[PDB]
């Protein structure tokens, strides 16, 4: 359709995980998880990732247990009906800020913060689109005005996002010590969201190399064996002794 | 067995249902005596060159025309729904 109603084509970058023999950047993964928890845990829900997933990837088991033991969950019936809260376990999912979709709609005007579990894989561009959307907030050009409750963002379809600028300068304190600019933080969040979309990337890319190597060797052997066996037919000689009456 | 089957055009070994042949001598060697990978590259290269020079345009013309109209259609459709296209 019209360029205004379809958005601006995303920019292209290079990520460590886009190569043929490269995994993730786990330090960036941990920093992105920290930024997620300290920023977008307030409204965006990630109710498809458990605390046990982060064990051995971004956190140790003791760290995961200690961090999860601070969230209060709701458990099954007591000895006489009732429902009693729990200090949290290592087998629960991350807490959703809202109890249902209608509460989310009521809180944020009329919008609905989408779940972030599988958003990177479900958008036309993935990491590039998400990063450009995060870093692409600019003042509107002359002639186009934004009504109250909307923001100008060229990368969004229609150039009308319902969000506000989520990542300002120095919003989080990184444990490693890197400065928290709007560029570094967005990159780390994009990396963490991509990991949350496909947590199985490393094992898949590790198996594929050996599979491809063995299959290539087998094909190279087959191409020779066929030529070996099909030899006495491709090199026949036919002579015609004319049958004189 | 029997069962008096129908009529076909294949038969089996021994009676393949073909015309009678006469005076057709045929020689062949053993796979263990001949040499694979002998003259493969030369013959394959010559055959590929001849096939490219012979068939060639038969595939070249329709695909080229289709690609040209594809590119033109994409360009024109992008232009028309832009600002200056609608005017």
């Amino acid at each position: 359709g019209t360029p205004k109603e379809e958005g601006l084509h995303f920019i292209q970058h290079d990520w460590p995980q886009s190569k043929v023999l490269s995994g993730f950047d786990h330090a960036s993964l941990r920093r992105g998880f920290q930024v997620y928890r300290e920023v977008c845990s307030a409204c965006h829900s990630l109710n498809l990732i458990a605390w046990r997933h982060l064990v051995g990837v971004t956190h140790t088991a003791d760290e995961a247990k200690q961090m999860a033991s601070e969230v209060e969950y709701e458990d099954g019936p007591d000895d006489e009906g009732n429902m009693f809260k729990r200090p949290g376990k290592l087998s629960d999912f991350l807490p959703p800020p809202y109890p249902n979709v209608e509460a989310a709609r009521a809180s944020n005007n009329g919008a609905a913060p989408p779940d972030l579990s599988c958003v990177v894989r479900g958008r036309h561009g993935g990491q590039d689109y998400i990063y450009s959307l995060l870093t692409g907030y600019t003042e509107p050009p002359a002639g186009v005005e934004v009504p109250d409750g909307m923001n100008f963002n060229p990368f969004f379809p229609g150039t009308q996002i319902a969000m506000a600028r989520p990542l300002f300068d120095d919003a989080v304190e990184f444990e490693d010590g890197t400065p928290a600019t709007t560029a570094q933080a967005a990159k780390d969040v994009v990396n963490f969201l991509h990991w949350a979309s496909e947590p199985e990337l490393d094992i898949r890319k590790k198996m594929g190399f050996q599979v491809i190597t063995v299959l290539t060797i087998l094909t190279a052997l087959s191409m020779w064996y066929k030529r070996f066996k099909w030899t006495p037919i491709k090199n026949r000689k036919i002579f015609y002794q004319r049958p004189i009456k | 067995g029997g069962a008096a089957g129908g009529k076909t055009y294949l038969g089996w070994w021994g009676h393949l249902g073909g015309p009678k042949q006469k005076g057709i001598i045929t020689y062949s060697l053993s796979p263990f005596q001949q040499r694979p990978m002998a003259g493969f590259f030369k013959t394959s290269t010559q055959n590929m060159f001849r096939r490219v020079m012979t068939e060639g345009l038969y595939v070249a013309i329709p695909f080229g025309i289709a690609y040209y109209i594809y590119c033109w259609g994409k360009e024109r459709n992008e232009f028309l729904n832009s600002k200056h296209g609608r005017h």
Binding site: T231, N235, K237, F239, Q241 | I25, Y27, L29, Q33, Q34, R35, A38, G39
Partner: peptide, 11 residues
């Protein structure tokens, strides 16, 4: 009847 075709190329 002809002579044996030369198979020395493939041998």
């Amino acid at each position: 009847s002809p002579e044996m075709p030369d198979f020395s190329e493939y041998q």
